[PDB]
Amino acid sequence: SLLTLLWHCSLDALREFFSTIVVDAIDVLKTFDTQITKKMGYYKILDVMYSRLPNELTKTLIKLCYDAFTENLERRRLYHCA
Amino acid sequence: EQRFNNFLKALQEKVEIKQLNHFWEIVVQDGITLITKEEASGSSVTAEEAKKFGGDVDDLLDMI
């Protein structure tokens, strides 16, 4: 569901929805299925909205997911991809 | 004279590549006397006027 609306969401509403969910995503960014699926969703919803338009906090956020790929069960590879 | 000339030039370069909080700035401010090569004149004295006068990306992409 969410990817379609995010692709076609109005850019103005995107701004305030982003402002609403900034901390709600930042905090949650940090059995096993629940967390990884939630992070699945978080990556797949944040990427499209970064694809819209460009402070300082964001400078950190990127690397908070970079290591999320560089780990050394297939859900793990899907997590890396997301 | 020339042996210590090249010695002193090398030492000036070495202290230059030593970035300090008390670096050759104190040496040079008193090195207004002699800090380069001196044999008799010319390239000697000219030398005076030549010298008398991912974590990194994390550093570079999180606070530049």
PDB file of C-alpha atoms in Angstrom, chain B residues 9-42:
ATOM      1  CA  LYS B   9      68.000  23.906   5.349  1.00  0.00           C
ATOM      2  CA  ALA B  10      67.042  20.279   6.003  1.00  0.00           C
ATOM      3  CA  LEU B  11      66.286  21.071   9.650  1.00  0.00           C
ATOM      4  CA  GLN B  12      64.162  24.071   8.675  1.00  0.00           C
ATOM      5  CA  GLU B  13      62.196  21.817   6.329  1.00  0.00           C
ATOM      6  CA  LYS B  14      61.885  19.178   9.060  1.00  0.00           C
ATOM      7  CA  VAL B  15      60.567  21.627  11.644  1.00  0.00           C
ATOM      8  CA  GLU B  16      58.239  22.992   8.952  1.00  0.00           C
ATOM      9  CA  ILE B  17      56.730  19.526   8.487  1.00  0.00           C
ATOM     10  CA  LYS B  18      56.339  19.361  12.290  1.00  0.00           C
ATOM     11  CA  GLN B  19      52.968  20.992  12.917  1.00  0.00           C
ATOM     12  CA  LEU B  20      52.997  22.087  16.557  1.00  0.00           C
ATOM     13  CA  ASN B  21      51.508  24.655  18.903  1.00  0.00           C
ATOM     14  CA  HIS B  22      55.064  25.990  19.440  1.00  0.00           C
ATOM     15  CA  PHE B  23      56.471  25.336  15.980  1.00  0.00           C
ATOM     16  CA  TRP B  24      59.227  27.118  14.036  1.00  0.00           C
ATOM     17  CA  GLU B  25      57.218  30.343  14.284  1.00  0.00           C
ATOM     18  CA  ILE B  26      59.123  30.911  17.524  1.00  0.00           C
ATOM     19  CA  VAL B  27      62.260  29.726  15.731  1.00  0.00           C
ATOM     20  CA  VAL B  28      61.666  32.037  12.766  1.00  0.00           C
ATOM     21  CA  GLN B  29      60.709  35.082  14.851  1.00  0.00           C
ATOM     22  CA  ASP B  30      64.180  34.747  16.372  1.00  0.00           C
ATOM     23  CA  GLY B  31      65.452  33.210  13.119  1.00  0.00           C
ATOM     24  CA  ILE B  32      65.482  36.656  11.557  1.00  0.00           C
ATOM     25  CA  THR B  33      69.241  36.346  12.100  1.00  0.00           C
ATOM     26  CA  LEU B  34      70.052  33.156  10.168  1.00  0.00           C
ATOM     27  CA  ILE B  35      67.847  30.221   9.136  1.00  0.00           C
ATOM     28  CA  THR B  36      69.131  29.299   5.658  1.00  0.00           C
ATOM     29  CA  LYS B  37      72.316  28.554   3.730  1.00  0.00           C
ATOM     30  CA  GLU B  38      75.200  31.033   3.875  1.00  0.00           C
ATOM     31  CA  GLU B  39      78.506  30.414   2.091  1.00  0.00           C
ATOM     32  CA  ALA B  40      79.588  33.835   0.879  1.00  0.00           C
ATOM     33  CA  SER B  41      76.673  35.550  -0.922  1.00  0.00           C
ATOM     34  CA  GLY B  42      74.092  35.194  -3.689  1.00  0.00           C
TER      35      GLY B  42
END
